[PDB]
């Protein structure tokens, strides 16, 4: 039968790809980085404590200037903080308080946010009038929005709960491209440094690397057990880290087309909420549901340090574009910026 | 600090004052979840209270304000977003009594009542709603009474005693729905039968909210 033939062909293709991945795995990252100098105990302190949110903080993003920060909470207010002087810059009242993601434009002119309303609202921060107003409302997604990322001042890529992603032109408000192929809900997005490629993790325990221009899925990566919640590109751009409900992080390389390293410990039995690298990529910072964040040696997978200063689970993590400091937001409605010391 | 820095600090203080005022204003509103299946006669309930994505309905009673969220149109895995409603005062569940003999559209043998029971079990026995109360509404009273007059309740409940009467069948349905509460010590179910009188339903909802608030306060005192 045609259906049986197609199923057999799909199974054969799966076997071929797994065999190729096994063959190309001539070695492992652990052996190569065995002799690398351990990073050592990484110690960080909360330099600033941003307060004012009266509900769970669900998302945050760092500006390109590495000084302005944007935070979104279920209270219904989107707050722009001045990290250096812990001074509030803007307080945008959100039409819908059920927001789970937020984004900050690379130029800082626009801020995008969304959630259970299934609409991505874009706010212009540099209008002639001294107030922030909605510039566009991207609607069309059949499910709740999970992540938002600005490609430029006019193009924005958003992932929703309908198991599809979409590239929108802000000026027209029409879906320029639609990305399909995920059999489960999409939970996170991560733009490549080149801005041409991106990778999306889904609840089906898999990540997919797509092409922005061609609107097609270039690669797929598996290895997680239950559900991927966070994803982030390695600074070089040829690799990305994924955090999952399995309480373990996994590093994948696009060129290798398979998992590279796995980060896990017997003391953690809770899922990963957020993931991010340092500027050099040596440190992999992952937020955990156990009221604290962890730092892993991206090369040796050793637990360098713990950032435990939140009374509730760490919901969002971010590293400044320059890597000077790392900000963490938790459900207790407090945002804390951590930095190291000599 | 420079003059511009002082002005920025003053602006931040004004923003903080506005945020505090907005939080104080919002703290006075009761938040209620709304859930159901098969439309659960939900449109009638929402329009009684009032008189894509989440739909928020605000209605003010004699002395209290209520915010109700209809997230039944989300149509996505509840695991990834249900936790957002951890702070809701109560969860209103709506069930159509006529679903006992109706077969789910997505299936061919499972009854809609079984799906409603499964959804009720999932929502009630949830780690995010262990201490949250549930207000259960049974909408299609008249249509259920008409159906049971000809179709026996055993079609959906083989274990049922087989008594073909309205009162006994309704009591059996209520008992079965309440039995799903595996955390009776921490939460309670306020079952009610919907009626054409809107004021009766609104009064019942207000009374349930008041009882929940009183019990929560008493538990704060430690008596519970």
């Amino acid at each position, epitope marked *: 039968s045609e259906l049986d033939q197609l199923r057999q062909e799909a199974e054969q293709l799966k076997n071929q790809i797994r065999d190729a991945r096994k063959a190309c795995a001539d070695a492992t990252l652990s052996q190569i980085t065995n002799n690398i100098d351990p990073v050592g105990r990484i110690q960080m302190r909360t330099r600033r404590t941003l307060r004012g949110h009266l509900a769970k903080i669900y998302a945050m993003h760092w500006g390109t200037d590495s*000084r*302005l920060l944007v935070s979104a909470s279920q209270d219904g207010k989107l707050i722009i903080w*001045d990290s250096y002087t812990t*001074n509030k*810059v*803007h307080a945008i009242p959100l039409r819908s308080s059920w927001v789970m993601t937020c984004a900050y434009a690379p130029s*800082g002119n626009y801020v995008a946010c969304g959630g259970l309303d299934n609409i991505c609202s874009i706010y212009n921060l*540099k209008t*002639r*009038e*001294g*107030n922030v107003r909605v510039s566009r409302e991207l609607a069309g997604h059949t499910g709740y929005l999970s992540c938002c990322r600005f490609l430029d001042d006019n193009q924005i890529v958003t992932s929703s709960g309908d198991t599809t992603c979409a590239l929108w032109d802000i000026e027209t408000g029409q879906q320029t491209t639609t990305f399909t192929g995920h059999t489960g809900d999409v939970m996170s997005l991560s733009l490549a440094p080149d801005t041409r490629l991106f990778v999306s993790g889904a609840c089906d325990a898999s990540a997919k690397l797509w092409d922005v221009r061609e609107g097609m899925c270039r690669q797929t990566f598996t290895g997680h057990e239950s559900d991927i919640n966070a994803i982030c590109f390695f600074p070089n751009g040829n690799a990305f880290a994924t955090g999952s409900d399995d309480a373990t992080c996994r590093l994948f390389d696009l060129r290798a087309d398979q998992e590279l390293m796995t980060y896990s410990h017997d003391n953690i039995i809770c899922g990963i909420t957020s993931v991010s690298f340092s500027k050099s990529g040596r440190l992999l910072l992952a937020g955990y549901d156990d009221f604290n964040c962890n730092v892993w040696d991206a090369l040796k997978a050793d637990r360098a340090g713990v950032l435990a200063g939140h009374d509730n689970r760490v919901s969002c993590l971010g590293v400044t574009d320059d890597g000077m400091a790392v900000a963490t937001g938790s459900w207790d409605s407090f945002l804390k910026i951590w930095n190291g010391s000599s | 600090l*420079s*003059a*511009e*820095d*002082k*002005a*920025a600090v*003053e*602006r931040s*203080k*004004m923003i903080d004052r506005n945020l505090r005022e907005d939080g104080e204003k919002a703290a006075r509103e009761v938040k209620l979840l709304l859930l159901g299946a098969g439309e659960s006669g939900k449109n009638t309930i929402v329009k009684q209270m009032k008189i894509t994505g989440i739909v928020e309905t605000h209605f003010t009673f004699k002395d209290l304000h209520f915010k109700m969220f209809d997230v039944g149109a989300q149509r996505s895995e509840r695991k990834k977003w249900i936790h957002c409603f951890e702070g809701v005062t109560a969860i209103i569940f709506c069930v159509a009594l006529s679903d006992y003999d109706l077969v789910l559209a997505e299936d061919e043998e499972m009854n809609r009542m079984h799906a409603s029971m499964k959804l009720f079990d999932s929502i009630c026995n949830n780690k995010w709603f262990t201490d949250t109360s549930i207000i259960l509404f049974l909408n299609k009273k008249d249509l259920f009474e008409e159906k049971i007059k000809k179709s026996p309740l055993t079609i959906c409940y083989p274990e049922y005693a087989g008594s073909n009467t309205y009162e006994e069948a309704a009591a059996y349905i209520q008992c079965q729905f309440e039995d799903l509460n595996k955390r009776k010590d921490t939460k309670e179910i306020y079952t009610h039968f919907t009626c054409s009188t809107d004021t009766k339903n609104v009064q019942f909802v207000f009374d349930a909210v008041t009882d929940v608030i009183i019990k929560n306060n008493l538990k704060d005192c430690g008596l519970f």
Partner: single-chain antibody
Amino acid sequence: DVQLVESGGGLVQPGGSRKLSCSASGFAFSSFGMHWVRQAPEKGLEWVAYISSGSGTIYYADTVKGRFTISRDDPKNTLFLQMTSLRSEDTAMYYCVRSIYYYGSSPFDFWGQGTTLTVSSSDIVMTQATSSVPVTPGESVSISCRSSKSLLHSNGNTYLYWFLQRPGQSPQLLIYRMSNLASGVPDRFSGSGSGTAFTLTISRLEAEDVGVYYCMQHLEYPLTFGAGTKLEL
């Protein structure tokens, strides 16, 4: 669009009093602090009074302190300056200026038309190189200015503002903080400076660029405007 309309003025007996009223439209008045700037006949700009958003802070010039009082009415989007004991030197054209303060903000971005007022019958000093210089289309010019006290704050921001006044028109902001071009201004202008010596350069002069250029310091009150430089075609 953003607009400020001032009202009140005319002839006043010496020692009299009157309330100047400015109406703001096209923008959130409550979110903007307000300044009053008076220009005497054939003279430079001079700061008068300032009221912050919400009326939380008020400042006056020593020549204005006590005699004139500033207030604002947010719901009607109005600004009031009640002047009493009007001296003969108070005759001038008064402009209302909006200002917004936050990281990356550009205060003094909009200036009102202002109104005329005439009578019957310890701070940073800013100076400019020359009163006037010749100009032709397509040429490059460099106006220079200096301040008694360094404007480079410890935070790293140099509080210098450049304003251009057209003949028969109110001044407009060109550059704020000595390094940020004002929104809508053509890219021809470019400001630079160090500590106490500042210069505004024009890559290629245009026929419209002719006008009176003023320099302002925002490091500390009172705000002092240097003598204007007349750029003549």
